[PDB]
Amino acid sequence: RGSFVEMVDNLRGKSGQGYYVEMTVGSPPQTLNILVDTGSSNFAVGAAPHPFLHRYYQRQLSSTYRDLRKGVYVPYTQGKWEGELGTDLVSIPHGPNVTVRANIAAITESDKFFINGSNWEGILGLAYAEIARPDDSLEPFFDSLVKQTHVPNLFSLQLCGSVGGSMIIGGIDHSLYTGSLWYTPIRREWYYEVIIVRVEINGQDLKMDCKEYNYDKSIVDSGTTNLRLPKKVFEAAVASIKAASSTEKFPDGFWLGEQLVCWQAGTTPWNIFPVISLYLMGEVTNQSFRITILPQQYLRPVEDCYKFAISQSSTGTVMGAVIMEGFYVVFDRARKRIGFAVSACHVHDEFRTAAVEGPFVTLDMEDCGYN
Numbered sequence: 001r002g003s004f005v006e007m008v009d010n011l012r013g014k015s016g017q018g019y020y021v022e023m024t025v026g027s028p029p030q031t032l033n034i035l036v037d038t039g040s041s042n043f044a045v046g047a048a049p050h051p052f053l054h055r056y057y058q059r060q061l062s063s064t065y066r067d068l069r070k071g072v073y074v075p076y077t078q079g080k081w082e083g084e085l086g087t088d089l090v091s092i093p094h095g096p097n098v099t100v101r102a103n104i105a106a107i108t109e110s111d112k113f114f115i116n117g118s119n120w121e122g123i124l125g126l127a128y129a130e131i132a133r134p135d136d137s138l139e140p141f142f143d144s145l146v147k148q149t150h151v152p153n154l155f156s157l158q159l160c161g162s163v164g165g166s167m168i169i170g171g172i173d174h175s176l177y178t179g180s181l182w183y184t185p186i187r188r189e190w191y192y193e194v195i196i197v198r199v200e201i202n203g204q205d206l207k208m209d210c211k212e213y214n215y216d217k218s219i220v221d222s223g224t225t226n227l228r229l230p231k232k233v234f235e236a237a238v239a240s241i242k243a244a245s246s247t248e249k250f251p252d253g254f255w256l257g258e259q260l261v262c263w264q265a266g267t268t269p270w271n272i273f274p275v276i277s278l279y280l281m282g283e284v285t286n287q288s289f290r291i292t293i294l295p296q297q298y299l300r301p302v303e304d305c306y307k308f309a310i311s312q313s314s315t316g317t318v319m320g321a322v323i324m325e326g327f328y329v330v331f332d333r334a335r336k337r338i339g340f341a342v343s344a345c346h347v348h349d350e351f352r353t354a355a356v357e358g359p360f361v362t363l364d365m366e367d368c369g370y371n
């Protein structure tokens, strides 16, 4: 409890390609790098020699593999994969010293799923059974982990924005954050759904009906890059950010994520860009707290050229890597709550820092949830 030195800095990645952890599947153990995803609930790994893959799960080499004789087809907005379901023994070498039997989707065919040039070969869906494919009877990895061992029912993530970080399975490491954790309820166990109750750009309340912030939901998602906002809310959001940054100028394509913007090095104009504050529903009636991020988070380096990493959504709010990179995030499943604290490793400058502050008084917070 409070210290897990063997799990610190167990995450790796490249900018724009996500955060992965080392895992092993099978007996004898086969090592794979696996993308950490709080926004889905399947453990799925490449199992055939797709050209983009450094390696893949070879079931024939595992004595502990059990076939479930069942297939799954998983289409996403743009990409898809299909696989064969089975179970096997799974470990996390820089995680707890346990081995569990978990469901695994052996990916046999995929389209626009694997990234050319990336160093990961599968995905670890850490969300709940409700959104597992093909249905909620396929037990997610973390559920199996907790069912089968003494690992406490929680994990935490420090995403450090080339990239790195920590996944603490079964606890919290207090070295990884400053100040206090502040918790928001998980509204429902499907995605890690939360409720946003107020939004400010540089102190300026958007003053929208707070229902709009969570239309049709708001989720915390390590498998998405952007801070994604409901269209109606995005429209208000950029309008205020554009106006806040009207000092200098960039094309209108930039704000729709349709083109990059560039400055010469040593001299990105950070200060003309506003901070973004999300107030989150608190643990107590009429009580909220707020988390604050920087352009460092929402203007993402591409290789000094940057993408604007806030975008509109038809799927609700998605607090992706743009948000999580400012914070140590505690997925306290046991108490159905999400904790945020200022990350010890977050990218900032000498003028502004990421912030987690409270308590604030906010009335009618339950009206903020969409139904």
Ligand SMILES: C[C@@]1(c2cccc(Nc3cccc4cc(Cl)cnc34)c2)COCC(N)=N1
Binding pocket: 016, 017, 018, 019, 035, 037, 038, 039, 040, 076, 113, 123, 221, 222, 223, 224, 225, 321
């Ligand atoms: C299943 C699904 C999925 C499927 C495949 C890859 C990813 N993740 C990613 C890909 C490429 C770049 C990334 C950079 C970051 Cl920071 C984080 N995830 C990244 C996520 C669908 O999309 C949303 C979701 N939550 N999970």
Ligand code: NA
Binding pocket: 145, 146, 147, 148, 149, 150, 151
């Ligand atoms: Na247990």
Ligand code: NA
Binding pocket: 174, 175, 176, 177, 178, 179
């Ligand atoms: Na601390």
